Structures are given as C-alpha cells and as structure tokens.
Design a protein around this nucleic acid. Structure first.
Length: 63
DNA sequence: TGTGTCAAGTGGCTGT
DNA sequence: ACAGCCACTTGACACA
C-alpha cells in the first residue's frame, strides 16, 4: 500500500510532455507510450499529465 | 506557520 | 454490452 507519494518529472521529462501537448491535444496508445519510453516515465504517468493540461488550459480562459 | 499545488485519484455520463 | 474523458477533490508536498 504505497502512500501516493507525490511524484515530479525531471524538468527535461516535463519539457518533452509540454512538447507533445503544445503540439497535440490527444495522444494515441502507440504515440503516448513512446514519450513514456524516451524519458523513462511509464505510460499512465504520460496519459495523466495529458488529462491535466486540457482541463487547465480551457479553464484558464473561462477565468 | 499553513495552503495551494501538483499529480493522482475520484466520480459520473454519453456515444460507438 | 463498451470503454474512458472531463471536471472535482483529495492526498502528499514545494512554495514563501
């Protein structure tokens, strides 16, 4: 029972995720498990940072 | 001296 | 029957 320690990605990992979202809003299963394998994060760690920029970018303009 | 942040987790609806 | 975002909160932690 791991206690969900927070987990951050190196700023270089994050740069490649900022990369795939700033270039594309929806990642397919092969595309997205490749960013996960270049930087060495797992696939669900990439898919989740993706769900986070779509609610935060749109919600910024509703503000 | 405590929140807001971060990423996950949660929780709830509609297509195909 | 199928499968999973889309938006709210928690659940640890970086901010100052």
């Amino acid at each position: 029972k791991k206690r969900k320690r927070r987990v951050l990605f190196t700023k270089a990992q994050t740069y490649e995720l900022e990369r795939r979202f700033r270039q594309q809003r929806y990642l397919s299963a092969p595309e997205r498990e490749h960013l996960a394998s270049l930087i060495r994060l797992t696939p669900t760690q990439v898919k989740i940072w993706f769900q986070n920029h779509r609610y935060k970018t749109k919600r910024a303009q509703n503000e």
